[PDB]
């Protein structure tokens, strides 16, 4: 589910696993989980520049190649760099949902061509707007407008006033949530415990619920149909399908995850 980030999460039956690109600098990415797929089929040597993780696969968007590449073991999409694949093909972002991966061409932070792969969108989208912030949702995938901000989904779909204007999206399961533009940065929810009122500074959307870091205090706080803790300062989150994880520093540890729903 949810943005290319510096963090992932992949989930389902295959076990839950947290994937992050190295405090180092090095854009190598460490996975700690109980899917050993993903796990032992992590890259000790293949650089990233984001991740974005599904249901029994994490994936990331590789820093010399440009192209999407995956590992793990899912009987929906395929691992490594997803056929079909133009040959010297590049990518801006990634985004994974839970059986499907969407890729922003690139023709440079914006594109109008999207290419996703997986179950039931193995397609080749030719929008007539420029795109950026792609955000995947589990039977959907967003992007914001980089003319307008405004918030754009495709693959039914909730619909949004295109005067909101974002900053920020994160796609969940049935839902997306959105950080306002401006200072305020209040966050609006909507789709198939309510928001907070606070400005956030990030926001992840799991299956059934969203959370996201306060700017003030850099505190966790969720809500949704399926809490938190609440003494923590995180500076990034990534959500799975009923588990959030929360990073304080890059010190050689195992993440810092709590389940709801």
């Given at each position: 589910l949810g943005s290319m980030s510096s963090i992932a999460i992949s989930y389902g039956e295959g076990g839950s696993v947290f994937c992050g690109l190295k405090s180092d600098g090095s854009h190598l990415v460490v996975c700690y989980g109980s899917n050993s797929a993903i796990l032992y089929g992590t890259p000790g040597h293949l650089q990233f520049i984001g991740l974005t993780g599904g249901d029994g696969f994490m994936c990331g968007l590789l820093m010399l190649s440009h192209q999407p590449y995956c590992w793990g073991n899912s009987a929906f999409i395929q691992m490594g760099v997803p056929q079909p694949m133009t040959k010297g093909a590049e990518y801006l972002e990634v985004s994974a949902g839970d059986y499907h991966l969407c890729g922003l061409r690139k023709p440079i932070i914006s594109s109008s061509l999207v290419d996703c792969w997986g179950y039931n969108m193995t397609r080749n989208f030719v929008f007539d707007k420029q795109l950026h912030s792609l955000s995947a949702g589990s039977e959907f995938n967003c992007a914001l407008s980089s003319k307008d901000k405004s918030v754009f989904c495709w693959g039914v779909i909730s619909l949004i006033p295109k005067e909101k204007k974002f900053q920020k999206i994160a796609a969940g399961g049935y839902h997306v949530c959105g950080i306002l533009?401006?200072?305020?940065?209040r966050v609006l929810c909507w789709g198939k415990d309510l928001p907070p009122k606070e400005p956030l500074l990030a926001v992840v959307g799991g299956k059934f619920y969203a959370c996201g870091i306060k700017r003030y205090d850099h505190s966790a706080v969720c809500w949704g149909f399926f809490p938190a803790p609440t003494g923590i300062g995180f500076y990034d989150l990534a959500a799975g399908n009923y588990f959030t994880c929360g990073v304080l520093t890059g010190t050689s540890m195992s993440p810092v995850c709590w389940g709801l729903g």
């Open positions: 533009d401006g200072l305020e940065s």
